[PDB]
Ligand binder design. Structure first.
Ligand SMILES: [Zn+2]
Length: 627
RNA sequence: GAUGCUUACUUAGUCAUCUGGUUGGCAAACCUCCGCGGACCUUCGGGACCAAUGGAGAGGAACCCAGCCGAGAAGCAUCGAGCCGGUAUACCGGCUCUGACACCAGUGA
């Protein structure tokens, strides 16, 4: 499909004042960078704002601007492979011609199709909203170098925030349509039309689901429970009766459609972009760490010279090995961390497919939760048919568990489990493999130690803010405490990621089988609820999946993240699926367990390692216990 | 290795009983109300977001900035542990000499 996994691997080094310029002139130079970072993050946010009205509406006939929308985001598909200048330069010309920032009208190039050339004329012949009129008036004075990097980020912003999140939703909606029907005929008990009637009943009392389930599955006894714990919802049930035979089934109908991807513009507050300085717009010295960042208005080769953190000696891509293509300036808090964009190539894997193909299967081809079993069959079959030799005897495979106490990675080659030797994922003065009152390091109790301070310190902010203008926590409320937790929580995902990758480089593994856990929460997580800010201290098991998959493709490997099973209540020798939920929990505390009748006496990590490798093959099937 | 000095430096990669502790704030930065105007989603109740070569106000709890102390970064100096060479057992010269880790910033709870 698309080449999502790029071979860039950008390294970010924080900025310092030069060793002998000043401590105050550095503030007056970063302010010159923040002012230019404010404009770039706002120019991008305006270009993506003007062009978004040309998007397909998913249910309307193809507008003439649709075939230009697909070229703005992905110019590579709509250009010949022998493009003269760049796939990023034709994107600018189409965006230039769509606006009034080019009076030359040089769009008539052989590489531009007539379907596209005649479509931009249908885009320029459109009234602007009096903000794009001044926007492209500002962008008209910009040099072509700025506009090239300006349309690129804006196009890559919608393509990454809306288009991929929307394309993953259309198929999620098309399969929801089939799933909706396949639920109606298969469950025709008391919802031929009553489900619509229940929607009207739910409309009169805006509830917009544990409480709803209790109200629906109630025989007038739940009224006492509702009073103890709601009161308004009881009226709807009484009105419906004037009931329980269809209430328990109408709730599972999920009348609400899957939510559309809410588009957000690049925000300087919470989630921003990084400003790119293209070719001839920066100078980097790596012997002595100084960076020549150049602003937009600098005439002929003057640069603001800063100092950055020294390039690590243990860093694997050395600056002399690969050339730096661009510098990505972003502002975390107030300190301007810049990032270096270089080219580090990938290695050919032992597969004729790509990781992006595996992305396509789960994201859009098999998006639904009940459609997970078919995803594994297609994902497994795709890898085997693209495998050069017999994949049933020489497909090296790893399956990690990624726990907090410990994690073990089983080694599979031909469905024959070799050895689940563990991972040393704990961060103390030395890399241990297990935890020897709060545990010092990357333990759950240490992360929650900031949260209890974060909760205590947030009780003095709302109290003081109430006396100022009133008489919960903004993105800036805990600028230093939260970012440190961010650099700490993601580091636990960075350590786990490389430990997997370093483990997968010792033995020539071709496939990593991760699970689909959401993550683990520190002890101080269930008390700071109702706040988006608490999301920073969530261990984010998906973040490890982010980094493991990104690195595995770099080293020439594929990652398959199976849907979340129990994976630890599943035995490894037999398919028992222990449902005790008490002996397993008690045994998991001490790190071991035992199968009820199978007799396997492995640990929770090795068994999880063995199961996940077995789940990839046809030996173990998913629970699928919805009915 | 231990010790000392200096630095328009760092203390917002993390861990190592660790966003170090503490004192305040002209400028400024940060911040609270409005939005010239746009714009995503929507149960049409709103949610969420960008935003003027633009309007005021205000808190140092928070953010921001600055000072001090502790701490480590480097540049240099002294001695010790270990390696080698020649000259006449010593000396000079050179080297390993200073923690670990990490660095790409589908659905749903
Ligand atoms: Zn068993």
């Amino acid at each position: 499909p698309r080449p999502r996994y790029r071979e860039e691997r950008t390294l970010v080094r924080k900025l310092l004042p030069r060793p002998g310029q000043s401590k105050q002139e550095f503030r007056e130079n970063v302010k010159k960078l923040r002012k230019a970072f404010l404009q770039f993050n706002a120019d991008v946010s305006g270009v993506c704002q003007w062009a978004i009205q040309f998007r397909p509406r998913y249910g309307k006939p193809a507008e003439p601007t649709e075939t230009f929308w697909k070229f703005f985001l992905e110019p590579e598909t709509s250009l010949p492979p022998n493009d003269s200048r760049s796939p990023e330069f034709r994107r600018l010309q189409a965006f230039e011609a769509a606006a009034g920032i080019n009076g030359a009208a040089a769009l008539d190039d052989p590489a531009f199709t007539n379907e596209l050339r005649d479509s931009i004329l249908a885009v320029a012949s459109r009234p602007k909203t009096k903000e794009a009129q001044r926007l492209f008036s500002r962008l008209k004075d910009y040099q072509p170098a700025h506009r090239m990097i300006l349309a690129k980020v804006a196009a890559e912003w919608i393509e990454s925030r809306y288009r991929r999140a929307h394309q993953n939703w259309e198929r999620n909606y098309e399969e929801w349509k089939k799933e909706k029907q396949e639920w109606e005929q298969n469950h025709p008990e008391l919802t031929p039309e009553i489900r619509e009637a229940f929607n009207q009943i739910f409309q009169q009392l805006e509830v917009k689901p544990a409480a709803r389930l209790l109200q629906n599955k109630d025989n007038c006894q739940y009224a006492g429970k509702n009073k103890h714990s709601h009161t308004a919802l009881c009226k709807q049930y009484q009105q419906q009766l004037s009931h329980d035979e269809l209430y328990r089934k109408w709730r599972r109908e999920y009348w609400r459609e899957p939510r559309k991807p809410v588009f957000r513009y690049p925000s300087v507050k919470r989630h921003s972009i990084a400003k790119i300085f293209g070719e001839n717009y920066f100078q980097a010295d790596f012997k002595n760490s100084v960076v020549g960042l150049r602003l937009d208005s600098m005439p002929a080769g003057q640069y603001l010279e800063f100092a950055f953190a020294p390039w690590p000696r243990n860093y694997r891509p050395q600056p002399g090995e690969t050339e730096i293509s661009s510098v990505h300036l972003h502002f975390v808090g107030t300190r301007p961390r810049i990032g270096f964009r270089f080219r580090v190539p990938h290695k050919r894997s032992r597969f004729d497919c790509t990781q992006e193909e595996l992305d396509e299967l789960r994201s859009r081809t098999f998006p639904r939760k009940a459609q997970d079993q078919k995803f594994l069959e297609a994902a497994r079959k795709r890898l085997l048919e693209t495998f050069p030799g017999n994949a049933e005897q020489e497909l090296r495979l790893l399956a990690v568990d990624l726990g907090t106490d410990s994690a073990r990675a089983a080694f599979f080659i031909g469905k024959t489990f070799q050895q689940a030797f563990p991972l040393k994922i704990v961060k103390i003065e030395k890399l241990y493999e297990q935890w020897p009152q709060p545990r010092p390091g990357l333990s759950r109790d240490h992360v929650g130690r900031h949260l209890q301070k974060m909760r205590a310190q947030a009780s003095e902010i709302a109290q003081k803010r109430q006396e100022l203008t009133g008489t919960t926590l903004q993105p800036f409320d805990l600028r230093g405490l939260t970012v440190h937790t961010a650099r700490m929580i993601r580091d636990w995902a960075r350590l786990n990621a490389r430990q997997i990758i370093q483990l997968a480089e010792e033995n020539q593994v071709d496939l990593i089988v991760l699970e689909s856990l959401r993550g683990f929460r520190p002890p101080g997580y269930e008390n700071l609820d109702q706040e988006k800010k608490r999301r920073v201290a969530f261990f984010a098991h998906g973040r490890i999946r982010r980094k493991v998959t990104e690195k595995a493709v770099e080293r020439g490997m594929r990652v398959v993240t199976v849907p979340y099973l129990a994976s630890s209540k599943v035995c490894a020798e037999c398919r028992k699926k222990q449902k005790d939920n008490k002996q397993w929990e008690k045994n998991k505390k001490r790190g071991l367990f035992k199968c009820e009748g199978c007799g396997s006496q492995a640990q929770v990590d090795e068994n999880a390692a063995r199961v996940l490798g077995r789940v990839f093959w046809g030996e173990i099937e998913l629970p699928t216990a919805i009915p």
